[PDB]
Design a protein around this ligand. Sequence first.
Ligand SMILES: *C(=O)[C@H](Cc1ccccc1)NC(=O)CCCCCN
Ligand SMILES: [Cl-]
Ligand SMILES: [Cl-]
Ligand SMILES: [Cl-]
Ligand SMILES: [Cl-]
Ligand SMILES: [Cl-]
Ligand SMILES: [Cl-]
Ligand SMILES: [Cl-]
Ligand SMILES: [Mg+2]
Ligand SMILES: [Mg+2]
Ligand SMILES: [Mg+2]
Ligand SMILES: [Mg+2]
Ligand SMILES: [Mg+2]
Ligand SMILES: [Mg+2]
Ligand SMILES: [Mg+2]
Ligand SMILES: [Mg+2]
Ligand SMILES: [Mg+2]
Ligand SMILES: [Mg+2]
Ligand SMILES: [Mg+2]
Ligand SMILES: [Mg+2]
Ligand SMILES: [Mg+2]
Ligand SMILES: [Mg+2]
Ligand SMILES: [Mg+2]
Ligand SMILES: [Mg+2]
Ligand code: NA
Ligand code: NA
Ligand code: NA
Ligand code: NA
Ligand code: NA
Ligand code: NA
Ligand code: NA
Ligand code: NA
Ligand code: NA
Ligand code: NA
Ligand code: NA
Ligand code: NA
Ligand code: NA
Ligand code: NA
Ligand code: NA
Ligand code: NA
Lengths: 150, 142, 142, 49
Amino acid sequence: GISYSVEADPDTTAKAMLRERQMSFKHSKAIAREIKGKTAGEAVDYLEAVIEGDQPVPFKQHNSGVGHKSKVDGWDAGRYPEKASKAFLDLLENAVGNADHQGFDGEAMTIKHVAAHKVGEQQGRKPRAMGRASAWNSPQVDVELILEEP
Amino acid sequence: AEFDADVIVDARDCIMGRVASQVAEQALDGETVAVVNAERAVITGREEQIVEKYEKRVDIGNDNGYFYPKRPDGIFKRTIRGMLPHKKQRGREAFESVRVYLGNPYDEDGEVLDGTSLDRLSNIKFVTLGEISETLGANKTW
Amino acid sequence: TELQARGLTEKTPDLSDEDARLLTQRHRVGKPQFNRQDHHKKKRVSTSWRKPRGQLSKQRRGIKGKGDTVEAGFRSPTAVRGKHPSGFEEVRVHNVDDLEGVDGDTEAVRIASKVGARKRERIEEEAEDAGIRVLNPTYVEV
Amino acid sequence: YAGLRTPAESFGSGRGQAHVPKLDGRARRVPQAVKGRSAHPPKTEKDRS
RNA sequence: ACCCUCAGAAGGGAGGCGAAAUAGAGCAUGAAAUCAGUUGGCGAUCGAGCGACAGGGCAUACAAGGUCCCUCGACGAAUGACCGACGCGCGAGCGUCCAGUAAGACUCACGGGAAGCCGAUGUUCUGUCGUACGUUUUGAAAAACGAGCCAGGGAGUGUGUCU
RNA sequence: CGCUCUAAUUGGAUGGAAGUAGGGGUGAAAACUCCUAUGGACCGAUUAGUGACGAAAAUCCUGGCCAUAGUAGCAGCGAUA
RNA sequence: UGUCCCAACGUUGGGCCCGGUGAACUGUACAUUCCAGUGCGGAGUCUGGAGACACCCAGGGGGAAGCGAAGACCCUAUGGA
Ligand SMILES: *C(=O)[C@H](Cc1ccccc1)NC(=O)CCCCCN
Ligand SMILES: [Cl-]
Ligand SMILES: [Cl-]
Ligand SMILES: [Cl-]
Ligand SMILES: [Cl-]
Ligand SMILES: [Cl-]
Ligand SMILES: [Cl-]
Ligand SMILES: [Cl-]
Ligand SMILES: [Mg+2]
Ligand SMILES: [Mg+2]
Ligand SMILES: [Mg+2]
Ligand SMILES: [Mg+2]
Ligand SMILES: [Mg+2]
Ligand SMILES: [Mg+2]
Ligand SMILES: [Mg+2]
Ligand SMILES: [Mg+2]
Ligand SMILES: [Mg+2]
Ligand SMILES: [Mg+2]
Ligand SMILES: [Mg+2]
Ligand SMILES: [Mg+2]
Ligand SMILES: [Mg+2]
Ligand SMILES: [Mg+2]
Ligand SMILES: [Mg+2]
Ligand SMILES: [Mg+2]
Ligand code: NA
Ligand code: NA
Ligand code: NA
Ligand code: NA
Ligand code: NA
Ligand code: NA
Ligand code: NA
Ligand code: NA
Ligand code: NA
Ligand code: NA
Ligand code: NA
Ligand code: NA
Ligand code: NA
Ligand code: NA
Ligand code: NA
Ligand code: NA
C-alpha cells in the first residue's frame, strides 16, 4: 500500500486513509480532484448531493462516451459515482473524527491533500465463446487525505 | 480602423505583382505597410485569359476548402501573402503588419514605389483589379 | 559555522604555453554527444554508443543532421587528453601510500569513493601537507 | 538432456504465433525459451588439460 | 499494549518496540514499463521520424565542473576594402594609386563586470539539415516483412582428423 | 572496452561495500570515475588464465504494465414478472 | 400478397441518459487534414500549395491498399503424402 506522499505538520494537520477499496479507480481520481481545496464539511455535503444525484462529478480524463451535464461548469462530461463517493464519505468521517479527537474543528478544516492510488487488482476470469476465457478484474484503491487548519 | 503605417503605398495604376513583391520585402524588414486604392491597381495581359485564371480559383474547392477572395481588397492581400512565409512566425508577423484598402482612408496621399507604375498612354492590354472583382461577382462597394 | 573544503582547493597546475593553448582548445571546440542512433525514439534503446550497421542507416550513410559518427579525427590533443578541466593530471588514490611520488604542481589526487571517512581524513591532511590538491575534498563546518 | 525432456511441438502458421515448440501452451526446449536447453553449454567431454 | 473512530478481530487515527517499520508479515535491496499527486518549461491560430549541430527565453541549494562578458592594447594565416586622385567605358561598371594597407579567426595582457553568473542540466523558441530502426531488395519512408511498452532470458560449442 | 570465476602481486569497507536514483568530470568511443541520497555487507586493481561473456529486432521466450475503456456483454430464446 | 411502384404509422426488445459490474481485438513512432505532384509505378508523414482554435457526444462505415490468416491460386524445392 501507499504512504503519505505529502509532508504534514502534526500540530495543524489531521490524516486519514482508505485501504485496498474495491471501487472504480477512475471515479476516485475524479472525486479527489473535485473535492480537494474544499472544507471537510463542504466535501461531505457535496458527496451526498452526488449520491443523491443532484450534483455531478466532472469526469475530465476518463470521459469516453460520457454524456454532458448542465451543472458541470467549465467542462461538459460528468457522472454520479455513488460507490466511490460513499467510500470518500467514510474517509472524511474518519479524518474529521481523528481531527476532533485532537482538538481541531474537523468540519471546518481544509482538504490540503487528497489523492487516489491504484494498489492492485483482485483478479477475475470470465468464460468466453470458443472455449476461451479473459480477464474480469476489480481495481483496488488506496487514498490519502490530509486536513489542515484554515 | 487606425493603422500606424510606416509607409502608405498607392496602387493606382501600378503593377500589382511588382507592388506586392516590394511590400513583402519591406514588411519582412519590420515595416508596417498600407496599400491604398487597391481597386485601381492593374495587371498586364489579355483580360479574357487573366479573368479565366481568377474565375478558376474561385471555382476550385472542396470540403477542406479553397477560400479565394473576389474583392480587389483580398485579391491584393492574397497576392502579398503568396510572397511571404505566412505559416512561419516571422512570416505571419510581417503579413499581419500589412493591410490593403479600397480607396484611401488616410489623409496623406500614398507614395508610388519605383518601377511599379504603368503608363496608360503606351499600354492597352491590362486590367483593373476592380474590373476583375466585378467580373467575379463582387459587390462594387467602391 | 560554515562549510569549508579541506586542502588546497584553489591550487592550479603550471603548464607550458603550448599545453594551456591546447587545453583551451579542447575546452572551446568540444565534441558531439556521440549517443547511439535513435536512442531517443525507443526507451529500450540506451544512449551508449554503437556503430550504426543498417545497410540503409541514415546515420551510417552520413546524412547531415543524423548525428556524427565516431572517427579518430574527433580525438582530443595528445598533450591534454585526459586532463581535468583545471589542467591537472589526475591520480587515483586509495590510501596514504598512494600519495607518494605525486607531484603537486603537475598532478592533483582523487580519493576512490570506497575509501571511508577515517582514512580520508588522514589522506586529506597529508596530501595538503605535500602540496597536493584533492579534487574531491571533505567539507567540514568551521 | 536438460531442457529436452518434453514433447513440445510447434503449431506452425495459423494462429498469429511464432513457430516455437509449446506444450500446455507454454514454450519449451529451444534455447530462446525459458526452461529451454542451453545452446552451447559446458561439456564433460572437453579436454581441460 | 492502551485510547479514539467504525457495522467491524477490517481499515484508519494516535501510540508502543527496534539502529532501522520507507524492516509490520509473499516484510533485505526495490530498476524499467507505468499510475496518483505535484514542480519546472510549453500551451486551446496551428503541422507530423520526435532529432543532430548553432544560437536565444525561462528554470536551477550545496557537492562532485569554473569559467564567462565588455573598452582598449599585443599577435595576426588565407583573404582583403571604403573614401579620395588620375585615366577608360554608350552603359552597368572597370583600371592605376592610396595598399597586400585598414580589416582579418584563434590566443594572450592591462583595466572593468557577471555568480543563475559561465559550463552543465530540464523545457521551449529561432536557423540549417532531416520521410525511424533492422531485414528482404537492382531500388525501402514505403501501400514489402517484424515489433504495443519495459525488464530479464535469447544464437560459432565439443571430440577426432587434416592443413 | 565490458562481464564471470581461478591464480599471483596488491588495495578498499559498518568513520558504510555492492546495487539503485539523481547529479559532476574524463575518453573519438566501447566505457572509466567522482558527488549527493538510498542501501546495510561485501568490494576491487595490476598481471596471467577462464568462459552457459555483451541484444532493439527472430509473427523470438517468460513476467509485468499502459492505451483500448468506465467501452462491449450483464436485452433478443413463446418462460417479457 | 408491402417482392416492387413508395413508402407510412404502430407493437415489443435494444439503442440514448443514470447506479452497479466490467472484458477483448489492436498499438514502430509521430499524427487536424485536403488537392496535386513525387517516390519500388497505389503517400496522414516526401515536395508545393490549400485548409486547420482545443476538447467532447451520437451516427452511418469513404480511407488507413483497416483488423483477422507466414496465399488454399500460380511457379520454384534434385519437399511430403
Ligand atoms: C482463381 O482466380 C482463384 C480460384 C480459387 C483458388 C483457390 C481456391 C478456390 C478457388 N482465386 C483466387 O486466387 C482469389 C485470390 C484471392 C486473393 C485476395 N487477396
Ligand atoms: Cl483503472
Ligand atoms: Cl471551397
Ligand atoms: Cl510559410
Ligand atoms: Cl498594350
Ligand atoms: Cl586512437
Ligand atoms: Cl589557439
Ligand atoms: Cl564466429
Ligand atoms: Mg455514451
Ligand atoms: Mg465449450
Ligand atoms: Mg531511450
Ligand atoms: Mg534450464
Ligand atoms: Mg521490501
Ligand atoms: Mg523486386
Ligand atoms: Mg539481457
Ligand atoms: Mg600485481
Ligand atoms: Mg541486429
Ligand atoms: Mg470505442
Ligand atoms: Mg428458448
Ligand atoms: Mg408477462
Ligand atoms: Mg504540406
Ligand atoms: Mg506464404
Ligand atoms: Mg493446386
Ligand atoms: Mg510423392
Ligand atoms: Na479526456
Ligand atoms: Na454549467
Ligand atoms: Na458546462
Ligand atoms: Na501579369
Ligand atoms: Na475557391
Ligand atoms: Na517432462
Ligand atoms: Na574431459
Ligand atoms: Na535552452
Ligand atoms: Na526480411
Ligand atoms: Na527500412
Ligand atoms: Na510504397
Ligand atoms: Na495487448
Ligand atoms: Na551467447
Ligand atoms: Na504475437
Ligand atoms: Na410490412
Ligand atoms: Na471507414
